[PDB]
């Protein structure tokens, strides 16, 4: 019934660009270690992430973070399609912009402070229209990928000069804020959920 189709579930890893799958399933799909897999969701939108082996993962389920899930337009109990990328390319152009609500009260240069350390030596896959959260930088800032050199997705090339215009963008209605209180905002209470 197509082994590339699995039911999306929650992930134990808070990695915004990583998914978890069972070893047996990884063998069925012929996946390597840090391979770049393409996840096709709903509304004809696909996302790219790295697959990790997890024993806590079912045989018909795939674990992923909230960001990728929402950006895949899928919800809990939905089915997505996973396929290893046979041909990928480096982003010879990176156009990212900060959100208007995430720049309230601040001013100056965010390029050399945020839109650089998250790209340099990062080597992460991104798609046009994806939103990533920078937690490793004092404050958790949300950044949206406007576009890249290769459409509609590519891998972050640290050798490429990232370009961030000095004009914040507005947030869409279907795009929630990572400042929202999720399950990761609850501590201690595990079995209470």
């Amino acid at each position: 019934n197509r082994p590339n189709r699995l039911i999306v579930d929650e992930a134990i890893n808070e990695d915004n660009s990583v998914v978890s799958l069972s070893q047996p399933k990884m063998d069925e799909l012929q996946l390597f270690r840090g391979d770049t897999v393409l996840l096709k969701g709903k509304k004809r939108r696909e996302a790219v992430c790295i697959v990790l082996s997890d024993d806590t993962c079912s045989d018909e389920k795939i674990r992923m973070n909230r960001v990728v899930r929402n950006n895949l337009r899928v919800r809990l109990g939905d089915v997505i399609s996973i396929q290893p990328c046979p041909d990928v390319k480096y982003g010879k152009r990176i156009h990212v912009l900060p959100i208007d609500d995430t720049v309230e009260g601040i001013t100056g240069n965010l390029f050399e402070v945020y839109l650089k350390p998250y790209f340099l030596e990062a080597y992460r896959p991104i798609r046009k229209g994806d939103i990533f959260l920078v937690r490793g930088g004092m404050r958790a800032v949300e950044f949206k990928v406007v576009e890249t050199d290769p459409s509609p997705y590519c891998i972050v090339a640290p050798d490429t000069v990232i370009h961030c215009e000095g004009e914040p963008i507005k947030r869409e209605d279907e795009e929630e804020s990572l400042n929202e209180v999720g399950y990761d905002d609850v501590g201690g209470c595990r079995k209470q959920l």
């Binding site: 012929q30 390597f32 840090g34 391979d35 770049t36 041909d87 390319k89 480096y90 030596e121 990062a122």
Partner: protein, 76 residues
């Protein structure tokens, strides 16, 4: 079944390199020595990110210590 679809992360892109079912580092070093024209005593094999950390800070052993999988992606 086993499928050798290993891909290498090059500055241009991540494509499927010409690899066989079995081959050693010397075999791969010889490939890049002709394809890219690199030298066996220059080309360094890395299977992880942290490109900036590769500068001196990366003194790890690419031997059985790190444990390379059958198709580990080379982050270049």
């Amino acid at each position: 079944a086993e499928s050798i679809i290993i891909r290498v992360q090059s500055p241009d892109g991540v494509k499927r390199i010409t690899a066989t079912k079995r081959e050693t580092a010397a075999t791969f070093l010889k490939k890049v020595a002709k394809e890219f024209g690199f030298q066996n005593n220059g080309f360094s094999v890395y299977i992880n990110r942290n490109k900036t950390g590769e500068i001196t800070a990366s003194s790890s052993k690419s031997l059985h210590l790190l444990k390379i999988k059958h198709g580990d992606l080379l982050f270049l």
